[PDB]
Symmetry: C5
Subunit: 365 residues, 5 copies
Amino acid sequence: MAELPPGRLATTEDYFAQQAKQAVTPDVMAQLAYMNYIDFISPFYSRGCSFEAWELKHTPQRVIKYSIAFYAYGLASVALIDPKLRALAGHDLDIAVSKMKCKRVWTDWEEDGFGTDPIEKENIMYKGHLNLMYGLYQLVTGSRRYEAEHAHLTRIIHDEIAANPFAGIVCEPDNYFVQCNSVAYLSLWVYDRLHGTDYRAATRAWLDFIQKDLIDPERGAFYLSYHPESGAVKPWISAYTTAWTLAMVHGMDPAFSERYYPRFKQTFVEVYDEGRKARVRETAGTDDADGGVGLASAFTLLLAREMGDQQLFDQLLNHLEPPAKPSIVSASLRYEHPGSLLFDELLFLAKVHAGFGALLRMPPP
Amino acid sequence: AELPPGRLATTEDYFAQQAKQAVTPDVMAQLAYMNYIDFISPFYSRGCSFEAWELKHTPQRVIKYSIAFYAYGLASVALIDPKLRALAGHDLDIAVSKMKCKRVWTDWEEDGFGTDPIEKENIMYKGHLNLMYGLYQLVTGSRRYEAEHAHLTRIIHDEIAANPFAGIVCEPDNYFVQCNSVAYLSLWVYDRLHGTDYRAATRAWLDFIQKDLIDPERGAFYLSYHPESGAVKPWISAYTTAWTLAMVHGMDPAFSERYYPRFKQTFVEVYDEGRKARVRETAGTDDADGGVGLASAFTLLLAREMGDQQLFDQLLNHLEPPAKPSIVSASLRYEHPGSLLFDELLFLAKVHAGFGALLRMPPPAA
Amino acid sequence: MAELPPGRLATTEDYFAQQAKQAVTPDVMAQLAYMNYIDFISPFYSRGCSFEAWELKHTPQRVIKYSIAFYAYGLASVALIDPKLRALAGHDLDIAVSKMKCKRVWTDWEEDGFGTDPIEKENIMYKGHLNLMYGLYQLVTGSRRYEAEHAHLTRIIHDEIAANPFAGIVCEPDNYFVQCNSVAYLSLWVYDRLHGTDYRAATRAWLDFIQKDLIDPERGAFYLSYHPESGAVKPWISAYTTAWTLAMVHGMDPAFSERYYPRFKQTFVEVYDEGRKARVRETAGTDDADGGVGLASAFTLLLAREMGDQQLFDQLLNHLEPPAKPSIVSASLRYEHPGSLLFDELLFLAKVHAGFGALLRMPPP
Amino acid sequence: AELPPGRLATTEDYFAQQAKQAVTPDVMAQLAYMNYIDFISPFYSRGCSFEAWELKHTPQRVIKYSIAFYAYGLASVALIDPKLRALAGHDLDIAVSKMKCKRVWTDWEEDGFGTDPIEKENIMYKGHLNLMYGLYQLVTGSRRYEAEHAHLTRIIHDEIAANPFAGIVCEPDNYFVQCNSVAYLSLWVYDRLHGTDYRAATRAWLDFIQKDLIDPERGAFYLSYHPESGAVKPWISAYTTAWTLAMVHGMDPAFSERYYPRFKQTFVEVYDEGRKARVRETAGTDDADGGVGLASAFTLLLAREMGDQQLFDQLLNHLEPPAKPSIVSASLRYEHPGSLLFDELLFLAKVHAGFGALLRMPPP
Amino acid sequence: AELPPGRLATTEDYFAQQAKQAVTPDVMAQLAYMNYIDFISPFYSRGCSFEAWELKHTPQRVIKYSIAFYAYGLASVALIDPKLRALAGHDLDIAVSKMKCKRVWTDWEEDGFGTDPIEKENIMYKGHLNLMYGLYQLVTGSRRYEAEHAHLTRIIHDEIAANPFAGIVCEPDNYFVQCNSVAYLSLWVYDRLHGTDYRAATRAWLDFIQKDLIDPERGAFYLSYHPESGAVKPWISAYTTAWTLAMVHGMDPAFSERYYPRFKQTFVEVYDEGRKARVRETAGTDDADGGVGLASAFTLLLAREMGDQQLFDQLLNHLEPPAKPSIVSASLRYEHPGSLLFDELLFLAKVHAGFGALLRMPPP
């Protein structure tokens, strides 16, 4: 739409036209100012192991790795939208990779008793994001700064997939999550684009595996998790799990996500306020929106963008953004009432997202 | 059945779960609380993370009992719905892993009783762990913990055999009948899995606890026994008795059937025109749920174990409505839990198939 | 007594008749339930170095040793009142002795810089109580569990008395308190009753010494303290000091305490409310009750019991107990407004106290 | 000549201090705050005691800037009143001592950048320290710190000469023109004391910062430069520009005179019938004093440096009255400081004799 | 003599204590506060326990001054009532023991000045300790601390003799006349006990402090002197002057008699129809008791030392009533202490026999 809805900073048409116009909207620029502007307390102020920005937002330790990654994913799309901001996006992605390696980000791995080395085995929730971030950094910048580490981590991931009886890698020992795997497989596509390798060949077996006990094909929704030791699949379907997984799979096998997307919307998406708004139920057998981790609507905003669904994108942003009370003060964006974890991260990402397939094809600098 | 005010499901519905091979929607919503949300759900991972217990303000000393009572409920879920048996098995694997984390047993070292929580005494911890090793193996058929199970069972057997009294202490010189009842039940479960006769020690135990440790006329156990002095604390305890009679009912049904009616006459107050009941913790008071505040919750478990639907209904009418349950996004929460171990013990009482039925759990499907 | 005064749990007559009836009053039983009943948080739950019960009452670290001792003194009288509770009293005294040895109880000695070993020398405020507790444990139980430690500590006390130029032992270096010595000398009488020794022979020289510069004979009151290095006697008389000292001396030399008791009462005791109540001034030259450490009235309740003064006992308990708002919930005693440190301890002790002389003569089990 | 509402002294009185060879009574009361009360005054002792900064709630990262800006004010006090020169010398000795305390530079180690705060990078710290070594020696004539001054000056010179860009980074890969301006000014002060030519590197620096780091039309520097990417953050910064133009004016007056009018057009909002002014931090906003909230305070310093009495008066009318100054027992306090570094930067702006005049400070 | 409103005892009653050989009931109640309650009274034990100071919220840096001022009062109690001399002796033994506890001197190490608080400098601590060693021995006749007294006296003598200025610094490069006055008085007390001539250094000190460190017309000392710069802080200080004149009166009575009237004209404000007085801390203010807030309390001590009953009465009428004294169970408490060291300095002023009379204390 071309009318600016109440409480919105920019029209859905304006977000979707950023790449064609080769310019980010003023509110996306103001988000980049929040990310970059103020000495010491802006999240992308320095490469150092300083986390003041996350302390001030009250980001739980366990969520910092996801905040960095989702910022990195948005920055990669900024590089594609405006050539003039590509160097800034490159710089922020360098900081994102540096910070991602700080102990504060991965310390949960050691503290839970799972090991002293966060990449050695398992922990795909951390090293999948890191591996995708190594790739996106190199696609944006053309820099080999992290290539040695990228080559190493890609091979650890490939070897661990090849050694497992199920297709993919666990997070915690004996905890398999389709959304964390989707990140790891996408990281192999990005490595292959940079290097001419075939690590992505493992994707087919993965897409076959997740379509057995891990999906409800009729509802177009993934079960919460799989636990190889017992073979248990948790018997609840998850909207945020499905929205995130379908978004990233759309970059590797578009037809897979196109098949399930309509069913996903029928299963979880509630349209309300005379068609102006939408909100997403987290699981089946409830009328409640945004239960569980409270991210169903925010990840569905990303999925709508990935699938080019302007009507659902507009409805979700009308639900999410106005109540959060955005303001631009000194050309910098802030939300008075962020409604969820990872709020400014996922709204930023959804506003700029060029598609995972378009990031794979990023032309060089 | 009529659904009483503030109740989620009828007593008829709870008692029919096993026959219908399905848990009630509120039991399913409790399993969602236990399993659903990343990082903060109690059964999210095997790791030594206790966020779920931090959020409920569980005292450190109570974490081991929370895990155990959840494990006991999960074992009945496995028996009720074969479709949830693999999930119950997975949760019990996590329960055993978490039970071994230092945060659970650290009180043993901090009180100055020793660095090894299994070596001797501390039956309050290792009794639960040993019963959980057994129930995990009954539900799953997995030998993951069998080496540790074989070891712990023999430490327990040896310590019983070496003591001049029948059983094992908690703290040095503190003997509790309820903590022993867990340890003896663990021997029955090991025997069912292995064809051994560790349970043969049970007769001598039942004889011992019926001397100075029970008031047979009131059907009630004294608080504790202290071998050094031979002192028995002169107060009878309802929560002690309800828990002990529930677990003994699985080993010697006649023992618990003998005392159950006297127990109810001694402690149970029926009120609100017969619709409700609440349990006095000791003699010589009108006050309900004194002491640790668990008399009513453990009596709800005993009522379920004894198949007493009328008392079960009365106790749940007392316990659940004021705690203000709600189901949000298919997950159960209580706004005002009335006691420690509240969601744990209401979960357990709602699903409990009987300790004898858990002993006889048929093996899993392939 | 016969009439139950307002806010009282039991008549004075009922407290004084406990031994004759061979039963504690229901409120004494409810105090024993507070002491024994609830898992982990009751003070006599376990032998371990756990002090939850004292944390919950906000007992200052320095006072924990006195709380344990005064509970132990009450438990010894319970053993004498009801043979059926003697085993329970024995068990609680075993716990009292175990806890008394925990570093949390004596840590003040090291932290003040006075030494790493709390029994080696001085510190009679700690080791006097411990030595009396060793003895009372053995009188109640017949157990030799602590006899090796009892034999050792008794000899350290005897040797330190014999080596000092003044009769007795200091607390802090150069701080002499008659009340702390009275505990040490009583411990020697208890050791002698158990062992047939004559350590108590040192008592006569002590009673001679304290009647010189340490007492005001006209007022029947002890000065606060004596300081051997300077020879200074603090020029203030102390009611709590005197009440405690006269109570324990009455068990060793009844005539000494009988001589001073009437003058003590004239000096410090204020009868009020038409003869129904009494409250005790802590020092001379004031109208104010219960100044200083605020224990004058509570220790005088103990002295009244020791001296068999039912009228003063009744008046003091009418002053102390009603405002503290006792209630019995689930057969366990609690005070909403304890008026002082060591409140439930000293009210328990005064209610059961059979006399220090009667504890010395406790028949075996 | 007329004292504006809520002001302690006229703009005329501040500008006349050096001619009259006396600080205004409120500047004297600021020096009393800095020196008077046992233990809690910021210049009480050389020791690594930071009570004064704890009481003002100074963030750890800002203590180094508070010390430096106090030191810069003390150097002008020395030039204004010969009778206070010995006191200014003493305070500058304490400023240098405290600047070396771990509490001041600990951020360098804790961020993971290294154990030695002088060795390389970190120009935000060692540029201020090097300028403070110089100003101490100019005021006092003392060689107390000369060995350290000679060493630090050579580290700075060598690091400039080794870099492919003109200057030195703060954090690794973070280049700030304002932090460099301090380092280069420190080389001019070392040269004045020693007859050396370290300042020769300034020309190449002024050429470099006029390429990608400035918008010449708006007279405004970009936030920062990042050598690894070559990225320049695409936002202009008023506090960055005001501080940089103030210090550059002492090295190349023409540079700052060229950009100053464009700077004012870009950022300065005159209000209240011409009586007041407040400074926007960046482009595309109406909001004053965004970001670190120091645009107006640094512009007060720039106005003083450029001899702009009208803008100085307007900014002080905006900054000082709402902060509610009072003098109690001849000591200045602000009830409502409007920013970090508030009493520091108002002190400095009130006394500032010009960076060029500090370079030419005659001996005692 | 009429008892003024809110007062515990008349000025006549305080001044008559020595003649009557009895402390007033309120001084006895202060001694009860100091000695009575187990564990929490300041003079309960020799141990390194500071509960009494925790309960009064005494800042760590002030504990050494609280102990010393209590000790100075206790020495006068010994002189007033022979019956309390042994109690005063006992309290002074505790004062010396506590003064040596790390909690009292830890600021020296934590500021980075050294691990040994007596070795050099730090006259603010070791001056008080040395005077306390002497007063303990005068009151008691005990040699308990003489070995340490002989040692510390020689460290002080040697450090004076090695310095180019007359006296010893506190913090490195911080010279305070009030802290020196304590050190020099300690040498007079050592000489009285031992027949030595350490006090011979006093004349050169009195000559030195009368140059740049005093305004002789106003009878007021400057805040501090800083040997490295030679700077004298340009503010005069009433509490600095009152304390220094009080202790100097014991060594050179004429010195303090010359400046006392000028001191009063400079700083003392008489108010409430002549019934009250309050002391301005510095020049160029109407505000009373600025800075550390002790001008009026130290002037109460100076009035007592100089035998000025009219000023003593006026100051105590200002200080004591608003602090709301009460005596509960024969022990003194103040609901609203108006300053640091409140009960300490009011106790000392009420008993103070004069520093000269303490020097001449006859043996037991």
